[PDB]
Structure formats: C-alpha cells, structure tokens
C-alpha cells in the first residue's frame, strides 16, 4: 500500500559525472529503503540498504541519503560499468515494493533512425510463413515506436521486436521488428508498410513495398 515513485525514468549522462536519482514514497517509511543495480539479463545487485548503508564490496562512489518520503541515490564519478538500471525498494519484514526503475545511459545528441523494410524471402514463403522485418538503425534516445500497416490497416498482436544495447562507439540504439503472417494472409494484401515515430524526425517516416515487385 506504499507506492514508490522513482525519478527520472531515464537519466542521460557522461563518464565522470556525478548524478542523482530520486525515490519518493507515498508515506513515511523511515529509512527502510534499499537501492539495487541491474544489468540487462542479469540478476539485481544490492548496493545500498537502510537508506544510506553500503554493502561490503560496493565502491564508495555510491551513496544514499534521505528519510521519511524523499530518498536520493548518488553516483559520484560515473564509470562505464555503472551504466545500468537502478531500482529503489521499500522493504518491510514480510513484503516489499519497488519503484518503476531508472535507466542510466550515455548522453549524446539526438539522432533520427535510418529505416529499412525487408519483404519475406521466396524460400520462406514456400514453407508457408511470411516474416516481414523493419529495421530502425542507429537512433537516440531509445524511445521509438514502430507501427505496421497492411493495406493501410493498422496491425496488432502479430509483431515482435528487440532492441540492442547502447553502441560502444556512437552510443546509439537500433531496433528490429518482425511482422509474421501465414502465406495465406500475406497474399491477401498488397502494400506492407512500417511507420516509425521518433523524437529525431520532424514527422513519422514510412517505408513500404508492394508484394510481388
């Protein structure tokens, strides 16, 4: 029944910086607050508990403060290993609640995606399935939307996507979306389009192809 509100959702910074992540509780939780670090696909790692106590082995650049309803996680001198998601947590004797989480990334300038669309290969079509792929290449920041249109009819429930981690050299992201249809459905329609929305574009970009051409 305690809602933990973490802020911000994304924190863009540079190596060497001192950054501050805020966590707010809907009611007083004294100092029963913990901070965790989590890397993609890895288990959470406890950094700070009792609001301000560091776990053994946690470098001193991490610190925490606050009591009652307002808490702060500080990282003084950001290193490469520190770009990750941070989670605040109210822990009670027999339950807990987490904040929404804060993703810390390397700051760079906005970059619009390059967009590409790939029709199904003839080989795949022969086996009864049609995967259409839309590529959003080297964009920043990470928030982007992909919309599939089939003969100008919005799709839903039939596409999946995955996103790469921030690039080692230009700190951008890329995204791949796959629309999957049966050979039967694919041949019922002619125009396949993926429409991309991203802060770097003056308006949405559409890439399309006509089946057969």
């Amino acid at each position: 029944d305690v809602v933990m509100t973490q802020s911000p959702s994304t924190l863009s910074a540079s190596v060497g910086d001192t950054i501050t992540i805020t966590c707010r509780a809907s009611q007083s939780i004294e100092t029963w607050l913990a901070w965790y670090q989590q890397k993609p696909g890895k288990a959470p790692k406890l950094l700070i508990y009792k609001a301000s106590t560091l776990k053994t082995g946690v470098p001193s650049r991490f610190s925490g403060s606050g009591s009652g309803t307002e808490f702060t996680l500080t990282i003084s001198g950001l290193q490469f290993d520190d770009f990750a998601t941070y989670h605040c947590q109210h822990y009670a004797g027999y339950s807990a609640t987490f904040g929404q989480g804060t993703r810390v990334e390397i700051k760079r300038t906005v970059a619009a995606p390059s967009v590409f669309i790939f029709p199904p290969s003839d080989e795949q079509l022969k086996s009864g399935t049609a995967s259409v792929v839309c590529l959003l290449n080297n964009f920043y920041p990470r928030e982007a939307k992909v919309q599939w249109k089939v003969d100008n009819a919005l799709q839903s429930g039939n596409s999946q996507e995955s996103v790469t981690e921030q690039d080692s050299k230009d700190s951008t992201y890329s995204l791949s979306s796959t629309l999957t249809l049966s050979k039967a459905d694919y041949e019922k329609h002619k125009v396949y389009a993926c429409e991309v929305t991203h802060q770097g574009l003056s308006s949405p970009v559409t890439k399309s192809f006509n089946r057969g051409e």
Binding site: W32, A34, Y36, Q38, K42, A43, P44, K45, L46, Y49, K50, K55, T56, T85, H87, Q89, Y91, A92, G93, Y94, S95, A96, T97, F98, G99, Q100, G101, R103, G157
Partner: protein, 224 residues
C-alpha cells in the same frame, strides 16, 4: 559464494498454470525469509510473494493474491511458487531472492538473487480448430464399403464433439481420442464407413463443435 537457481519457466496459455522452484548453494534457507520477484517487460521490478521462516507468514502482491501460492522446504532447501489462472501481465522474468544481511535482523534487504527464469503468458486462452476433408478414395469397391471423414487439427483445449449430418448418421461412426502435437495443440479424426453406392446421392457433412472457443464448423466431404 551464495547462489540461487530458478526452475520451471516456459510458455503458458492465458488461464493456464505454471509452477516454479528455487534451489540454493552454500547456505541453508531455514533462517531466511524467501521471496519471489519479477521483472516485467517495461523493465521495472515487482515484489510477488514472500514466505517467512517456519512458514509462519505468507504475503502476496495484490495483483496475484488468490492466484499464486508460495511454499518452502527447509529440509532440502527449496522454495516453490505456484501460479494459477495466469494472465498476460504475469509475463516477466521471475527471481527468487533471499532476505538477509551480514547479521540477520527483523528487516533486511534482498542480499542474494537467482539469475531469473522467463515466464511468458500468451493472450489466447482458446483456439478454434481447422477442419480438412478426408475424401473417400475413388478406387472403392463396386457395391459398397467406402470410408470418409474429417480431420480436426490445431485446436486448444479439449474437448470437441463431432456429429455427422446433424445427428442423422450414427451407425459406423468412430471419433478418435484426440492427440497432443508437439505444437501444444490437439488433433483428432472422425470417420464413418458408408455404402460406396451412396456417394453422389447422400451428402455428408461433419459438424464440429469446439465449446471452449464457442466455434462451430460444417464441412462437406465429397469425392476427389
């Protein structure tokens, strides 16, 4: 080095059930409150359930209260999570985490976590069958004895009922037990033997009823 390892993740259909287990290395759980936590696709963590030492207290996230159960096995060091009536928003990575610290107290943080096991709930709780004809062979014997039928493929869950010509044709009908395919969908066939002399005079249509998806299909089976 303390370790935890989850087991049991996989793909579940909405409404389905899945049970997870948690095993440990290099410590005994008896003194620890044990917890389940999940990371949802949006990236945030959600506390799911906790079970105190001696199983004195079990507590659950409101979203799962009534549908999940947590159990512990202090003697062999396992923790279990039962998930029933699973919902799409239960899709997440599930972790088993120990409540603990250098010296235990009445309220410690989660100091050790498992690597996580992936649990994915698909939106479809039901799927309607495809129906394909089993056409009678053209090379039948002149005088009678011909077989025809329907193939009822790729449905979920059981059962389906099959009637022939809305119940008028019952003699000689065999509807086989369904079989579960490697796809996780069922399939069965219904066949009937009729006089070879009757193809061309009597029309034959199999009536398939999949009540779980409230779907009905009538399929006319004709030679060739």
């Amino acid at each position: 080095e303390v370790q935890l390892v989850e087991s049991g993740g996989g793909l579940v259909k909405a409404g389905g059930s899945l049970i997870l287990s948690c095993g440990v290395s290099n410590f005994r759980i008896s003194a620890h409150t044990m917890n389940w936590v999940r990371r949802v696709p949006g990236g945030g963590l959600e506390w799911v359930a906790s079970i105190s030492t001696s199983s004195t207290y079990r507590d659950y996230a409101d979203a799962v209260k009534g549908r999940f159960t947590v159990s512990r096995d202090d003697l062999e060091d396992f923790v279990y999570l039962q998930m029933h009536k699973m919902r799409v928003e239960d899709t997440a990575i599930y972790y088993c985490a120990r409540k603990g610290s250098d010296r235990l107290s009445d309220n410690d943080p989660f100091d050790a976590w498992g690597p996580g096991t992936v649990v994915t709930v698909s939106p479809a709780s039901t799927k309607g069958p495809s129906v394909f004809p089993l056409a009678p062979s053209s090379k039948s014997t002149s005088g009678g004895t011909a077989a025809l039928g329907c193939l009822v493929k790729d449905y979920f869950p059981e059962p389906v009922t099959v009637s022939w010509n809305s119940g008028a044709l019952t003699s000689g009908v065999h509807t086989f037990p369904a079989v579960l395919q490697s796809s996780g969908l069922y399939s069965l066939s219904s066949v009937v033997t009729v006089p070879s002399s009757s193809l061309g005079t009597q029309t034959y249509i199999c009536n398939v009823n999949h009540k779980p998806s409230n779907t009905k299909v009538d399929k006319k089976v004709e030679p060739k």
